[PDB]
Write a sequence for this structure.
């Protein structure tokens, strides 16, 4: 009957139903949010709402994303403290209606009376897409954002730079795309799989970026760009080897392989430093959200050990751990950002491998995205007074196989990462109440070594995405896989109407 995903914190079914009619009147940034709602509602149902049987009141004691939704025979009442809260209330309202309403599509109207009080458990409810390995483009990204918005996810992490490609136009360094965005293989080589010789790639112009930022903002999704440095940087090194390469005498090309590249940025070169600062400057212009992800995963120190300037620099900082070069590199970038005006300042996120270095050089106002040995890494981060986001490889990497069936498309894993396994992960299990404030939230990540087709992307994304979304929103004590299964089954219709692909295993 009522199938709400994410499951609200508190839901009480009440007497009777609220009948819309064909018109009604509403008492109300908030107006613009409601305006959007009105458009979608009219599109889907034909109901017109004039500017009262619907009231939106400001309740300043509610958290930033919280709301109350009271539906009775007489009236729909909504309370929230911020625009986002009102948006989420209206998401829930739509979800109380036939699926075509959430789909925004007319088909060939009442609400059940309810009392809802709702707030997200976590402020960070994210999805990351890797477009470095395979590029999907503007239309598909809009579809991804649409999927996220359904389940009240609010953070899109854009993994735009890799060994195998660079996907964002940087004005001051045009070769990043000219070289970095194109390569002579669609598939990425691994084991017996060899490069296929086909010219393949693509990138976003700064105009494209701004359009996608705007589109997401309308659905209260903030975009975090990732420029993954100084590892996972072979494409950038291929573009500008003279100052980025540790070994600029050697050949440097965009990588056609899967795996971990040793062709990392020369963090000791001064022009490499200037490059990074100027990239960050351009990002600051395109991305208004207050966070930047600088990566820091899987960065072999091997080439630094064979580089004279790097050996010298490591000596001057008085370290025996070549990992410290990476951390010192981040320090200079962090310091640089701190000199800029307040409105141009950005907080930094890193993958948890950065904890393997002497991080006290950086300070503790960084955010750690925990992926490998994630549970332990997050605890480690929280203990050091750092904020942390949980994105464990198992089971939050939703590019991994969701089934063992021989008919599944090719991707990583052995099919153990089922909807059930994703849902059953408990982010806060055995996490001391004193550490919990540092846990900003959760994220599903999607790596695209194997995934090249939008249809396969969607197939793997859904419905596991919704499970992570619910984990991020619904308090643990209110979560239940069997209940979730029953609720998510109702979204098959929504997916069909939207023309989204999805795994059918639990449908
Ligand atoms: C943060 C991070 N760095 C690595 C690591 O996660 O696994 C990804 C693939 O994971 S998967 O699909 O489970 O094998 C890989 O694409 C990425 O380069």
């Amino acid at each position: 009957e009522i199938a709400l995903t994410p499951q609200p914190a508190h839901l009480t079914v009440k007497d009777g139903r609220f009948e819309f009619g064909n018109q009604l009147k509403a008492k109300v940034s908030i107006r613009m949010v409601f305006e959007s709602f009105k458009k979608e509602l009219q599109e889907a149902t034909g109901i017109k709402v004039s500017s009262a049987r619907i009231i939106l009141d400001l309740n300043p004691q509610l958290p930033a994303e919280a709301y109350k939704l009271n539906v009775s025979k007489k009236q729909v009442r909504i309370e929230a403290s911020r625009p986002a809260g009102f948006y989420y209330a209206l998401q829930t309202l739509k979800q109380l209606m036939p699926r075509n309403v959430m789909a925004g599509v007319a088909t060939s109207w009442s609400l059940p009376s309810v009392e809802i009080e709702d707030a997200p458990r976590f402020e960070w409810r994210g999805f990351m897409l890797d477009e470095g390995r395979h590029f999907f483009g503007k239309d598909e990204i809009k579809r991804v954002i649409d999927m996220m918005a359904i389940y009240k996810m609010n953070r899109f992490h854009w993994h735009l730079t890799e060994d195998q490609g660079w996907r964002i136009e940087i004005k001051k360094y045009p070769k990043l795309t000219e070289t970095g965005a194109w390569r002579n293989s669609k598939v990425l080589a691994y084991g017996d799989v060899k490069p296929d010789g086909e010219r393949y790639g693509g990138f976003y112009t700064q105009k494209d970026i701004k359009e996608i930022v705007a589109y997401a903002k309308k659905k209260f999704i903030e975009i975090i760009p990732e420029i993954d440095i100084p590892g996972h940087s072979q494409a950038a090194v291929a573009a500008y080897p003279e100052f980025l390469a540790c070994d600029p005498r050697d050949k440097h090309e965009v990588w056609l392989q899967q795996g971990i590249s040793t062709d990392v940025i020369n963090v000791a070169n001064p022009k490499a430093m200037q490059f990074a600062k100027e990239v960050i400057d351009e990002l600051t212009e395109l991305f208004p959200f207050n966070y930047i992800h600088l990566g820091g995963n899987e960065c072999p120190t091997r080439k630094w050990q064979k580089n004279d300037e790097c050996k010298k620099l490591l000596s001057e900082i008085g370290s025996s751990n070549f990992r410290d070069l990476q951390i010192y590199f981040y320090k200079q970038l962090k310091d640089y950002i701190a000199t800029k005006p307040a409105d141009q300042q950005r907080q930094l996120i890193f993958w948890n491998e950065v904890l393997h270095g002497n991080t006290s050089i950086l300070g503790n106002d960084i955010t750690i995205m925990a992926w490998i040995g994630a549970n332990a890494a997050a605890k480690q981060a929280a203990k050091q007074g750092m904020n942390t986001i949980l994105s464990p490889q198992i089971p939050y990497y939703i590019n991994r196989k969701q089934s063992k069936l021989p008919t599944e498309p090719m991707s990583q894993g052995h099919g153990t990462e089922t909807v059930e396994a994703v849902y059953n992960y408990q982010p806060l299990k055995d996490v001391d109440a004193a550490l919990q404030p540092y846990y900003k939230g959760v994220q599903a990540n999607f790596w695209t070594e194997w995934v090249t087709e939008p249809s396969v992307l969607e197939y793997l994304m859904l419905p596991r995405l919704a499970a992570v979304a619910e984990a991020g929103w619904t308090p643990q004590e209110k979560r239940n896989y069997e209940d979730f299964k029953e609720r998510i089954r109702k979204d098959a219709e929504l997916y069909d109407l939207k023309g989204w692909n999805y795994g059918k295993h639990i449908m």
Observations:
- The chain has two domains: 10-118, 124-498.
- The first helix runs from residue 30 to 45.
